[PDB]
């Protein structure tokens, strides 16, 4: 098993970082270009970032659903800024219109200035307490249950979502975060645990922790990894583009941390495929890639790396 | 002027009320049919309801925006269940993707059980206090201000919506409600005051009240009305269709209150229906939000029968 | 087995015949409405008429293909006004973009004024000779053959269509016409034989003729019927609607529930309650008719009316929709 | 006064010529990608090729029209393989559905084997006689006339197209061809005369010739040029990209004829502009100084190069492209 995702640049696109030269603004037309590109090329889905620097994820995901056939949308929900019941009704509606193509990314929100701008004044420990109570109401409501919940942060009485989702029991929950409270939350409620691109040894340390905590609850979770990718026909062109990307550091074999100014895979197709094989051998089944620009690099990655990956990507 | 809206049946559609016979389930395909029908027929916009009994308004409005050209979308926001900054960012994004075709309907939420199901436990006065503080942040945030606000219910620090809306200063605010707090809220913040279908005397009393309260805030508000409509070629067919609607009450000339058994409706021939519309416009009402069962067929019926009797541009479409 | 089609009014739509009152002009928006209506309601396909009084069938069908999911399109080809090779490439392209949703309606062209307006000057016998040679080149080219053909009317040397169709051996061929030469052409080359709405005994006679000729060619052809439909909740409302359709025509039930009023302006129609309409459909189906191409005025509302009133009385999958 | 077109690769796309490696087959999805790219990037229109090696132009242009807003479509008609009345009705329908975005490319058909494959057996002189009679019927039919015409090759009686086009008197006629009979036909009937990418002096001779013949008919025609384009940030990368494009071309199936005018693409099917953005814009400025107002560009791959040309060359071109 392997699910290869791409990325929707709802915060802006371009060729280079740290400059407005060659910048591509977020428009409906260009978002359609990237989304329909990932759709026809055979990517499993697309990840939509969230935050103050982005256009709204739910508006954009809903706008692209009727313009695409098979592509799934990994949409972020932010507990603490919306009612869990309302969030569940939004998820059910979009999952129904998409015929079961919705995936949920649970985002706790790190930036305190951004959280206060949204009206949330919570400590780090309180944010995960809200997410824990949020997901409990959200998951139970989407399964047809009339929820009565009174927790430390959230309180609902007779919460109902009258329109059932297509995916059962609910759209899959993706979650990232390296905190101790985050790993407990992932092991208890989520379906796929996400991590940034770290060296294989450090990733295995994170995975084994979540795997053990989930076993204490009698659960098993799948694993995914997030990686930028600069892949070229030869290794020389790839590193030249990585330098060119940050004009205006190799922490592991072909693992470049320049985008963190998380990390990126830089090299020829065999090198890039070998690092993917190393991550897959650890138990990772989801891969979320990105590249600059997001339109051209979606074709670049599909034409250079897909033939070296397992089916169905080998046949695309 | 005059803006004639239609209605998206996101709570279900059909031929008859109080029965599942002849029901049409809400699907993406059928919502496209109604929306694209209103788009090509020349309706100014379409109203999307909200509530526990509906699919989410924002998902549906966003899905239909890139499938329509001119049609506007009157989407409901519910203060008290979402952060004002986030709601403004949702509004800005949909207004930008739609190229300035977004209209916002401020809905406070009447059902106390439904409000408790969403996590809101507020008295009647408290719901309007939240809406007042919600709108103050929402309006200023969409105007490019980094807002610091600390009220009784809401508090934001450095609230920003980085992507400006297309419509300036922000998408127009439509608002309904007959409470004392509702008329005060409308007179101070909203752009269009909405009312259900009542006899002209009852509407004129409401319109005169808001108009006087808005003058105390140095503003003028436009007025709109929400009305179901059962119009046929002759008056006999219209009343027979009205009777068949509730098989499984005329409180005013051609004003039928049968739909309130599950507001009111205009029933009659085109001249009778057009005459009641002229009466409402003579009171100062410029927006009309109509509906009919089924919403696809009746949208064509109203357009072909009543549009020629309305002012331009509807007379020429 | 049963295929229920609808109709795209590419010549104009409306509520009444013989008047411009309540007319709906052919626009892209209104064509999308009808096509997407038939798509979502579950009709097998939609028939697109041809002629000088219509917009071009190929432009409209190609425009609606990416806007619909399952709906098939019965598009007309006119032998004698286009090269067979070029027509084959058009069919191949539209069938590929549509993922195998193209159906071909072979129209020989009856009106002599319209045929001369297009530059075709052929007698009745010559008209079918051209169609016969056209279909042979068309069918062979779409099967990957480099065709050398030199006939009485058409001549090609090394005719090739490089892009194969999705449907094999080629998009299904529909054909109508009751003449002796038409039945010989249908029994030999086409896939579905079509007929207008006649009384069941009159339909059965044509079907028996084509069925007898096709057995001599070692083939079987399916049969379809073209029928207008005015179905209402009660029989009284249905006949009142039929009267209103032809009210504005200046100076009728030729069979049980078979009304020939639509044959005034430009075949027949089924008028009655849902059980009466479903029974006449069962009679036609008992004769061997497997395709039904229905129409109604207006084409948007009546597509819903027929689906909500008649589909539950038809075989699956229409009974469950 | 400049209209910049792109190209729809309805015959196939890819990264390199002479190889199937990295090839992109013609699909509805990929055609949507290129067409919607040119639409949103601000290209005036897109050219759709014709021939036995292509998918049908009319099906593809009609399929993409309802998926685009401003992009125009330059679609080929081939006289001799379709009735003029039918061809005119097709044009009228597509021009109505597109709200006046249809452009017509008059293609006479050069390949004799391909013409015989379609049933056309005509000499070079006869081919232009058919086109001349075809366009006369086509133009008049689209203007509401019931046309009675009896020529050497075509004959119509009461030819009518009942649905008028949006663009008056008819969708603009584009025409290419360097033959002596071709220049006579262009000077008499068409709106825009097209030429392949030749040195500016050779182009000036063709344009001045057509200009003079059109004055003998009391008309003026606009001029356009067809050019491939390989533009990179620096001149070195552009020539390196040009060399890599024809690396895999077999010598069995077998170059800078002018400053930045490279004839390597003509080894399969004309010429290309190769260089940095300033070099490419300067050669465009030269052709425009001759009187050329339409420019039809293409690049491999056609999706990526549509963005590349718009991001590198549009700012150096006149308005409105300079602000896009």
Numbering used by the authors:
A (entry chain A): 0 to 247, 282 to 294, 300 to 354
B (entry chain B): 0 to 247, 282 to 295, 300 to 354
C (entry chain C): 0 to 250, 282 to 296, 300 to 354
D (entry chain D): 0 to 253, 282 to 296, 300 to 354
What did the publication describing this PDB structure actually write?
The monooxygenase MsuD converts methanesulfonate (MS−) to sulfite, completing the sulfur assimilation process during sulfate starvation, but the mechanism of this conversion remains unclear. Termed two-component flavin-dependent monooxygenases, members of this family lack an NAD(P)H-binding site and therefore require a separate reduced NAD(P)H:oxidized flavin mononucleotide (FMN) oxidoreductase to provide the FMNH− cosubstrate. Here we report the first crystal structures and biochemical activity studies of P. fluorescens MsuD, which adopts a group C (β/α)8 TIM barrel fold. In MsuD, IS-2 and IS-3 are involved in forming the MsuD homodimer, and two homodimers arrange to form a dimer-of-dimers architecture.
In the absence of ligands, MsuD crystallizes in space group P21 with two MsuD tetramers (chains A/B/C/D and E/F/G/H) per asymmetric unit. The 2.8-Å resolution crystal structure of unliganded MsuD provides a snapshot of the enzyme prior to FMNH−, MS−, and O2 binding. The two tetramers align with an overall RMSD of 0.34 Å for 1188 cα atoms, indicating their structures are largely identical. Of interest, residues in all chains within IS-4 (between α7a and β7a) and from L354 to the C terminus lack any electron density, preventing their modeling and resulting in a very open structure. Without ligands, the active site lid, the sulfonate-binding loop, and the protein C terminus are disordered. A mutation in SsuD of the residues analogous to H10 and H227 showed little or no change in activity relative to wildtype, supporting a role for both H10 and H227 as secondary shell interactions to the MS−-binding site. Both R296 and S299 are located within the V295-G300 loop connecting η7d and β7c after the lid region, and these residues are completely disordered in unliganded MsuD or are observed in alternate conformations with FMN absent or at partial occupancy.
